[PDB]
Amino acid sequence: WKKQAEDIKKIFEFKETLGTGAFSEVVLAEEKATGKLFAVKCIPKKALKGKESSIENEIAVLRKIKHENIVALEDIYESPNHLYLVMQLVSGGELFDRIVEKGFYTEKDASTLIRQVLDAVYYLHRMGIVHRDLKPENLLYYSQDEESKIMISDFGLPGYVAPEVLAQKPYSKAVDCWSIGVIAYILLCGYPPFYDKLFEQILKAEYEFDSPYWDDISDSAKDFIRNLMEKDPNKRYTCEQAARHPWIAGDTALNKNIHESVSAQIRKNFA
Numbered sequence: 001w002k003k004q005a006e007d008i009k010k011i012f013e014f015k016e017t018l019g020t021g022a023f024s025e026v027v028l029a030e031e032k033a034t035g036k037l038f039a040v041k042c043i044p045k046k047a048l049k050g051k052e053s054s055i056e057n058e059i060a061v062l063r064k065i066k067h068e069n070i071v072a073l074e075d076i077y078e079s080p081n082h083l084y085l086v087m088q089l090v091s092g093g094e095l096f097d098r099i100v101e102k103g104f105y106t107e108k109d110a111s112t113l114i115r116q117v118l119d120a121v122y123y124l125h126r127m128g129i130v131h132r133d134l135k136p137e138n139l140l141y142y143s144q145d146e147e148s149k150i151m152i153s154d155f156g157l158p159g160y161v162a163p164e165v166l167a168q169k170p171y172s173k174a175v176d177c178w179s180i181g182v183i184a185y186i187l188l189c190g191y192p193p194f195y196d197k198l199f200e201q202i203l204k205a206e207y208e209f210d211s212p213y214w215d216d217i218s219d220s221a222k223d224f225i226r227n228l229m230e231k232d233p234n235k236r237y238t239c240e241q242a243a244r245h246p247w248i249a250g251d252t253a254l255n256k257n258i259h260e261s262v263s264a265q266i267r268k269n270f271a
């Protein structure tokens with residue numbers, strides 16, 4: 001299944017860096033043979049010393065599985081000193097940019113986005129993957145199209161982080177469900193639920209649906225968010241429980257244009 005390369009540059013022309021990490025870089029690459037674009041995750045094998053085999057076994061599972069709402073793993077190249085995970089390039093644009101650029105945006109739009117994220121995350125959890133890094137930067141549109149799905153653009157083999165992680169307590173898949181709750185909060189008002197003391201507010205899950213920003217938001221949406229942004233990970237909704245909530249599965253999401261306020265808050269609260 002793994003392709004071998006003496007030099008990855010025989011296969012790909014590398015262009016702009018999309019993301020950097022601990023001994024991992026995602027770069028825009030053109031396949032020389034075809035002209036097709038990809039997002040290539042470049043990993044030094046030295047950084048995988050001890051776990052190489054386990055990570056390869058897990059890559060070997062995921063290369064066979066495409067989720068509608070997750071970046072596809074298209075190929076894996078092995079050079080003498082690197083692994084290259086050739087990922088689907090998700091090119092439709094960024095999450096907050098779309099909302100700001102739209103003239104019209106409703107709770108049903110936010111609910112449609114969260115439903116897709118819950119589907120993707122439920123799948124990762126079944127495969128034994130805790131994402132741990134769910135935030136708007138990892139959510140990109142497939143296409144510039146009106147009807148484009150959203151996709152988790154990247155995953156690994158403070159304001160978005162669960163209280164139990166900040167508490168240095170044991171944590172589980174539930175940390176992702178907290179992050180989806182925080183993203184849902186921002187999608188409905190345009191600002192983060194925690195900011196200052198900040199650490200203490202997250203630790204105590206101290207947030208509010210403050211006026212006027214939350215006045216025209218449904219009680220159902222507020223209840224949905226309360227069930228995900230729940231301090232106790234045992235009490236917190238799973239992805240499965242969230243996907244059954246009427247705001248996702250039913251018809252409680254409102255059809256009021258809340259674009260003006262959400263777009264103003266996104267512009268004011270982010271760089």
Ligand SMILES: CC(C)c1cc(Nc2nc(N3CCC[C@H](N)C3)ncc2C(N)=O)cc(C(C)C)n1
Pocket residue numbers: 017018019020026028039071087088089090091092094137138140153154
């Ligand atoms: C936001 C910007 C850096 C960006 C990201 C793009 N794609 C991806 N980006 C990234 N990263 C950057 C965001 C955070 C993430 N952990 C790493 N990773 C994957 C993709 C992808 N699958 O296309 C594609 C594009 C364009 C070139 C289509 N721009």
